[PDB]
Subunit: 263 residues, 4 copies
Amino acid sequence: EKFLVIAGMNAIESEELLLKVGEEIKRLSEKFKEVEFVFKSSFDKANRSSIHSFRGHGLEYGVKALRKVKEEFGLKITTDIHESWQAEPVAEVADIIQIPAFLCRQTDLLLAAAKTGRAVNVKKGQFLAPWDTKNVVEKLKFGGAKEIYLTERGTTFGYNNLVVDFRSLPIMKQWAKVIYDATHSVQLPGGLGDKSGGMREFIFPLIRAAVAVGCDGVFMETHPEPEKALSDAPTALPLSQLEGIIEAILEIREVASKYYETI
Amino acid sequence: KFLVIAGMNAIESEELLLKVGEEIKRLSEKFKEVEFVFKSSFDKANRSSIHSFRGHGLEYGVKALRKVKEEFGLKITTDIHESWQAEPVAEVADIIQIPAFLCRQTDLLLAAAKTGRAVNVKKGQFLAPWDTKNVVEKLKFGGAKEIYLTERGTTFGYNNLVVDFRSLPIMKQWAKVIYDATHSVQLPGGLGDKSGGMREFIFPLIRAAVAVGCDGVFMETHPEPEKALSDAPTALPLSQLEGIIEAILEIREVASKYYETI
Amino acid sequence: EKFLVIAGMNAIESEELLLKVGEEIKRLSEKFKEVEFVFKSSFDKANRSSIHSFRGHGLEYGVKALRKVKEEFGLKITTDIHESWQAEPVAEVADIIQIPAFLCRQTDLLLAAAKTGRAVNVKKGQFLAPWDTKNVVEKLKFGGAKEIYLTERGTTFGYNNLVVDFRSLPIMKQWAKVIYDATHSVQLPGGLGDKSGGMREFIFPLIRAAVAVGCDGVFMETHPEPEKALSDAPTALPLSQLEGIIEAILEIREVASKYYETI
Amino acid sequence: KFLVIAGMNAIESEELLLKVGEEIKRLSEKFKEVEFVFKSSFDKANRSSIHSFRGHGLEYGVKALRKVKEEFGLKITTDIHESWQAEPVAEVADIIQIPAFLCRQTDLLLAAAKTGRAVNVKKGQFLAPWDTKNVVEKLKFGGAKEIYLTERGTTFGYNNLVVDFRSLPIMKQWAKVIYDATHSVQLPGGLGDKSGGMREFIFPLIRAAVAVGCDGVFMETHPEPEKALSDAPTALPLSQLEGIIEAILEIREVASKYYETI
Ligand SMILES: O=P(O)(O)OC[C@@H](O)[C@@H](O)[C@H](O)CO
Ligand SMILES: O=P(O)(O)OC[C@@H](O)[C@@H](O)[C@H](O)CO
Ligand SMILES: O=P(O)(O)OC[C@@H](O)[C@@H](O)[C@H](O)CO
Ligand SMILES: O=P(O)(O)OC[C@@H](O)[C@@H](O)[C@H](O)CO
């Protein structure tokens, strides 16, 4: 099946920066034709640790910025919602509606996304066991979702740290397509006090493990200059490095794929 | 004075809420040394299964809570799940409760703060004790004056929660601390389509909470927990509430002498 | 039943310092007559993180130092063993033989302690679940142990951190007397790089929880001047504070005891 | 070259050890690109239950290992539990293995180092990746020259282990890293009187190990795991060893291009 690569910018800092990333993703989509690319960005960071951190420029502005990316580059779009009412307006531009990790248990948010007819991708809560995502998928199907994804983004391991339990990939594959969030799986929640920390040095190694184990796609956040990111500065991947990473995981996927177990 | 938040997990019917409110009222008259606050949810917006009990809606719930408040003169507290619910709930709730999974949703916290009511935030199972300082700051920013932080367990491996009592002293630095004796022993998604829990540890850990030092306790009860529509494994039998309260007041009286300063 | 208070110095730095602590413990035993005191110290720290850290002055010297404490103060003695052969020589002076946390699963070490006829106290490994200590007690009984204790000293919670799951007290009480190690439960394993860290500020609060929940005794490490300790410097309790802590837990134990659940 | 440590958890009989050694020898002849080391324990000194299988003693075990080495010319590795065992074991073992629970026992490490043999330390389930730097230093101090650090899971809640693959890159800074594909999926004391495990995850995680980058893999096998006297839930069927080895060599070949420098 066609490997999915969700990539973009964690937050919509400016429509201009968004298009810069979109142009690169567009270029990569032309090269890696065997990959289905979906552009990602959030119109709002509704769960920053601090009240003083960047959130965004509003749903209206965000949707406008995303629609511009879809129109100018012909790229599929994905963004996350935080409250039920946002599902309808977002569904107009988003091909895949993302459900934040902390909200993976909020029945109404899930139902609101499902009735739009759009694909739904749920970030697995850091408090959730792999086998407990089965009920998450059941809620979505109940609400009309036909295309469902579950994203592995790490699990609470002690304080301010996350661990990736790769056993979750084959477990979750039993009821939905699985995506590996290579970015947030290495973040250190609240690690920097008023902001979360992260270890970029482990992004690549862990993504290699992800494709070796076997998944249906990867999620990666990028930025032209991570150091200047308004969110995920510690984990944003330099845009120039995206191509090399994708090539690498496609190669590892190919050689490992014959050994992928059948569910 | 010491705060005791009690009631039942969900509003299964105003008839049941009234039965429980009656007992809480009685206890309230028996323990003048305690400030009781009646709690119940008008909606279980985060059940594991789509087929589990959620409630009768916001309308029915707010009405039931009003009845409890008018029929027993008891303060009220209930949780909200989306920003728009803060205003209508504030009309009856003396304390707006923020769910654990939602402790980081800025707009929810701000909506609660804006109502002018007191706010009690359940500490996320994914949150470190010191990470609550920022939660408090958001509320102060939103104009909140009476802020509570509730300890309800931390993720410990899968389908299990552990109570790290070092959190009480730590959180007390920036807010009043409440100990949720009910959910701290629950086993997240333990029964598959529902969460589990071990009631035998409720009392022991509640004693630890007051020995350590907290500003209040949170307890969910039910006439017949066997028939509870939520928190069935952890709901405390109504008849046992009095004994436990008297117990923690006695322990608190002796232990309070050693509570470290802020 | 008579509450047990195991106290002393983590390591036998010098026979002189040992006697200084013993004198204070002796004084407290005279005051708190309802408490059974047992003097503790290790003739060897066989598991320091670094090869450069203090270990001790040998089994021979240690036993001699301990025997001096027992003779001069008439105090019961307890010390830990690391290899099977040490059980015999140690049993000559130790009333209770302690089994290190990392070694709680070493069958031979446990058996060696049990056949001496002495009481045995096993520190619950940081990797052990409360209910898995049942097999630990079974091994000891099999080996002849008639007086067995299980000590709660924290559980691995993420890296370099330990959490105390007080549910372990009533669970473990089902098969053995339970002791709460107020000292090591707040240590940060490997926290200081070549040495473990710790948070002394939580020692008192956690010990209060221990007696409120209900245990059969407490274990506390002390030192005239913690800052100068050769081991457990971050968690050693000032000797002058020992009396106040004991008085406090006896008071909390009394008021809470009527509520202790029956196993 | 790539290291593959294989054999069976316990020496149930030299007859069985020889059957397994034969297969390992065959594979050794098939994969010249790999260095095979035969492993087996002469004693399970840490079983959960007093009634579980330990072995036939140090004497019987060392003799059985000698037979394997002489009859197949395969290098040997076995674990020690007390300091006195290092010398007699060193006579046959090319690599002395240090158990996970004992990774902090200074005298055990020193005794192993003193024999002059290579030493492989199982990373304690209670140890942080960076905490192994000190383990290595003790061995260097004791004169150890060939030092290995093995990843075998970390405590994650109760009766469960999680493999944090960030440990491979971290540990590689101070030693060669081996991935124990067998015990990393075991469930400590999961069956009550015995430990559990999930064999379905052995292969998937072994693939992750080589995709990330390690100097070797550790695998326990058994003709009929159903009849194994230890590691029954995790022992890999002997017939499946070849397929998995070929698989990790292929993945390693492609992935090695991206292994970060030390
Ligand atoms: O406010 P901080 O803690 O930096 O949070 C960063 C997060 O918002 C980021 O990891 C992500 O968008 C999570 O929700
Ligand atoms: O997993 P289930 O059983 O649906 O449980 C959800 C409950 O524990 C819920 O009431 C709890 O208060 C969640 O916040
Ligand atoms: O070498 P470090 O890591 O400081 O170890 C201190 C320990 O020996 C101490 O916590 C205790 O004696 C544990 O075994
Ligand atoms: O808990 P039980 O089943 O006795 O298991 C012990 C085994 O897993 C043992 O062989 C393992 O290698 C311990 O180190």
